[PDB]
Amino acid sequence: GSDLGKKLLEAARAGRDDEVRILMANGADVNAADVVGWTPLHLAAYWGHLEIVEVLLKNGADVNAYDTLGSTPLHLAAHFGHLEIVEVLLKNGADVNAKDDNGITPLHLAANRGHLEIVEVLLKYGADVNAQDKFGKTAFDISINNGNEDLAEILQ
Amino acid sequence: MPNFFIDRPIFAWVIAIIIMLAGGLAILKLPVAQYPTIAPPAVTISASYPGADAKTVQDTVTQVIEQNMNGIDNLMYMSSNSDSTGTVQITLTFESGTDADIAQVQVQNKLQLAMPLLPQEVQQQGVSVEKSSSSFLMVVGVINTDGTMTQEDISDYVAANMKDAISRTSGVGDVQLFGSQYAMRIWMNPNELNKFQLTPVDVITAIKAQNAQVAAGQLGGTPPVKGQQLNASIIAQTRLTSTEEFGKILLKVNQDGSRVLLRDVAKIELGGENYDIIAEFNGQPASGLGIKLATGANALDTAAAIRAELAKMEPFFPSGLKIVYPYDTTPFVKISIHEVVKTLVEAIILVFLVMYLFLQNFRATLIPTIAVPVVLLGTFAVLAAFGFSINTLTMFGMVLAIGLLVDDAIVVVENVERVMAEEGLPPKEATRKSMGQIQGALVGIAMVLSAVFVPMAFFGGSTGAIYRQFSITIVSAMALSVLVALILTPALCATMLKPIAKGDHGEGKKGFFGWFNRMFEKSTHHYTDSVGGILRSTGRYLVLYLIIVVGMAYLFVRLPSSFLPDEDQGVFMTMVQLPAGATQERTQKVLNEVTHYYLTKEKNNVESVFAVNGFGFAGRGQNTGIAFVSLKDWADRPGEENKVEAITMRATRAFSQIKDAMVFAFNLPAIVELGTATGFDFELIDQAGLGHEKLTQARNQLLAEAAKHPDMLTSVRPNGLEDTPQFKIDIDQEKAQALGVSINDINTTLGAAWGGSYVNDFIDRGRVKKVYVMSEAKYRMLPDDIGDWYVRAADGQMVPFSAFSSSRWEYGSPRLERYNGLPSMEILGQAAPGKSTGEAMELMEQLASKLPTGVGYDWTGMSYQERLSGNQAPSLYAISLIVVFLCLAALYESWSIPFSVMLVVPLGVIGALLAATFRGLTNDVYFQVGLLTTIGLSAKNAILIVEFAKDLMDKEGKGLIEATLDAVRMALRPILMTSLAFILGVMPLVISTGAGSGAQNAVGTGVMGGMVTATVLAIFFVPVFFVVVRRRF
Amino acid sequence: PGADAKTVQDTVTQVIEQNMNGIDNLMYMSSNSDSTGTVQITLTFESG
């Protein structure tokens, strides 16, 4: 964990595009990570900062970095409903079917929060619709427990 | 009245003596404290929820209490924070003048009725209601120096053997322990537990069963069968008392008949109730007591009594235990009382010297000497009557007041001496005439200062509390000064003064004095000649005067405004803040650096560093700490290099280099009770149901806009804490139900192990104490440790926590704030240099108005007070101007002549401003106290002259110029004597360093500079004022 | 209920008494704790 790295982790979280731009010019570690293993790309994906996601990816950020519980930026973007960010990540190679330590996928997470467009985008990019978490649940299972009829039909 | 007492000098003495006795009595009965009550009454509700995160606290405790704070009288506002240490504090602030006891009981009663809506474990910990707006008399640290006791050992000792006896000490109003008494600590081992198919639930159950008080009854109890011989209480099970007993608690009997004891699945020891704070005193384990003054007590008595008690405990101290005093406000009271005596003595000396220099006889010299103690004692009596205390502010008013009593005495004696030398009249009839000449001037000066200071007492809130202390000392002193001058001093003049031959101005005397008289009599002629020439050309002097008034306005508006000047109070703070998620150990490393810095590179100034790890003022947690730095006495720290500002400067500059930590020294607020009256204090409010994340976004939006006006807004920042990573764990209900694992077993196992659980009480050496279960440290550190905890299913199988849960990282708040019952975020900031806080507040309101829908705001604290203080000021100044005018109009029987006096006010004010600006001081309350006294004093010179001149025209038919010239001729000496005495007396205030030298320098330079220009300008300008006013009208 | 004098003194009476510091005008305080578990603490104040 380096100094400019720390500054990058904060700037990304805080969505300060300009500061991030300058930091990129100065070579701030795009692979910096906090104690729980979040990279600036995790932070931007979490808090929804679209431009910074794009800029980080231009500058070599690991699109498939995982935190200490195995969660990726795609996990975070899908869970918190950041549609344009989910599409950018997938275009830049994000593992559509990445499982975290619990066997949970971006699809599980999107389905659980009722993010219809995101579910569709994840299916478009090849998300495994039959993927089971550590409890053997699918995104369909999650849909019907939640009583989400729209989403339930999407997953047929 | 003067004629009455001139013939009755013994009656006069009797009144003087009764006044002296009244005052003497008052001094015996008067409370003695550092400060009056200044802050508005506040009541804090405090509750603790072991193992709870900020939101759990807020949503099961804080909100419920808040929804019940209804039907309480005189509430101004309510605020709270809920944090992830498991703590809530709700602080209710009441109108100034509210009875603090009634406010507290009203709050406690509303709480008591919400208690059944709180979580069981919070009801168990209890919810404390306390007066919050009180401050510490002193802090007693207790350390151990032979490395034999930990801070828990010390705290338990203090609580068992010192606390109660300090509370019982005379004058002590409240005592807080820094730490806890011991608690019985059970540190569970998940491996051992699982080995015997046990869970934390079994541990808690067994403890409740086998450490308990069981009622039983009596043998031969009523109603008995008759004939019964014995009545006796049955004693059954009573609480456990030792670690061995808890160790031997039976948990399980196996099949092979062997026994599983508590000590077989747990470490057992006496420990602390919590471990959130590490306190060290110069690197050594430390506890301590924070002590407050009882209402109406004597701070000095109490401090001596506290020390006396500590001494008699010292023979029973364990080895290495030592008492230490890192904070003691008692010096300040001591110094202030000394200052008053010191000023009293040197003023008596100064008046002696000045009277003798000019009047050249000891008898004349005695009369003012007798007057001062009389008037000063009476002031104490009045002070007592109106329910004030002896405190730093009132004592400060006393030292100023002494400078003003002086004049009445001098003016009376000098005028009698003049009248004798000029008319040859004998002492008695010289005195009768002389009093008729100065009576009204004496009353008028008292009236003008009253009309100025009394309205200042009616400022509300904090400002009015400070002013009041000066208002009542200065004005009482004034009333009594006039009273004594109309009763005792004329009696003394007529009886003690020796006759003077007509035309005996001592010009024929010998050596120095004969020289001085000839020198002075000639100077007076040069003086009056000047005035005559001036009066032949008033036009240019009106122009000159406009230049001054214009200058005054310029200087006033460009003088920076503050509320209270920083003081060197012999202690200061060092903040330590590490990044989010930083651990207790890392913070301790930084604090050790800080401590090392001061005990090394500040060895000549620093007495001690008390490092508190885990404490902040605006957010707790493992990543914040504070170092309290205590200094050697000011005397041992010569020069500005060694005062708090300099030391702080170098500490901060040295600490800039430090790692990943923000570390910087900073001074106390001038009045710690009042607590920082700098800048503004703004509340951003969730007015719909936007929620925490949305409120953060608006906060950030507002903070962005503010930072774009460096010209108007500076250092505009959150008072609270940013969101941090938190480990979110989800229990799968279905899998729990399928394995037959109860949700209650799951949640008890997790909470008790990782959070700790208060089980019940035991009794340790005769004192009741808490029993806590919790995991040993090494089984609750990391996410991997989670799967080491097993819960027992209905079917007796042990199930790993990993089988029915899943987890992920997320952000959330470590400290949630609320204002008046709604989600809030407090923002601090201040006006840019050159700008008024008023201006800066307006821009904030302007920026706040562009925020997203549903975000509101409110002003709190100092801002709330200022918003209502500044709204009061014009009407109060207006009343003062009107009453000053009306008294002079009555004094002169004229609607116009009061202007000739009133015009002198800028002559004094310009000096005050000049001295302030030159010395680089600011417009704070002490400077404002200085201006006010500067008004009264410039008015004094003017009133003397205008009175002589008007009386000369009315009674002796003299022309306008003839009277004016004779008036300033007569007024010159008493104006010069009273100014020389005042200027010399007030000088210590000007040059003083350390120990309240802030306030002193502020009042001193204003008051001295003001007196210099007022007397240097008045003696030429008020003849002009009188002449053109009488000419125009 | 059921507590003895020593038990009720240790867990009730001293607990309450340790909080009765710095009440205005307090002249003295007396208490008893007895074998039926009842505690009485009486505080007497200056005459005015």
Ligand SMILES: CCCCCCCCCCCCO[C@@H]1O[C@H](CO)[C@@H](O[C@H]2O[C@H](CO)[C@@H](O)[C@H](O)[C@H]2O)[C@H](O)[C@H]1O
């Ligand atoms: C010989 C010496 C005698 C000295 C006597 C001094 C008397 C002082 C009396 C002050 C009494 C209160 O004086 C003051 O009253 C005014 C008007 O009612 C109030 O002022 C109120 O009215 C003004 C003008 O309408 C508003 O702009 C202001 O927002 C509002 O607060 C003040 O809040 C109160 O402090």
Ligand SMILES: CCCCCCCCCCCCO[C@@H]1O[C@H](CO)[C@@H](O[C@H]2O[C@H](CO)[C@@H](O)[C@H](O)[C@H]2O)[C@H](O)[C@H]1O
């Ligand atoms: C205790 C502190 C003492 C500090 C004293 C320091 C010096 C202060 C000087 C005060 C000014 C007095 O100055 C006084 O001015 C007036 C003019 O206005 C002069 O008056 C003379 O000149 C003017 C202008 O030509 C004529 O109109 C006037 O008829 C003439 O007599 C006086 O000769 C002079 O004495």
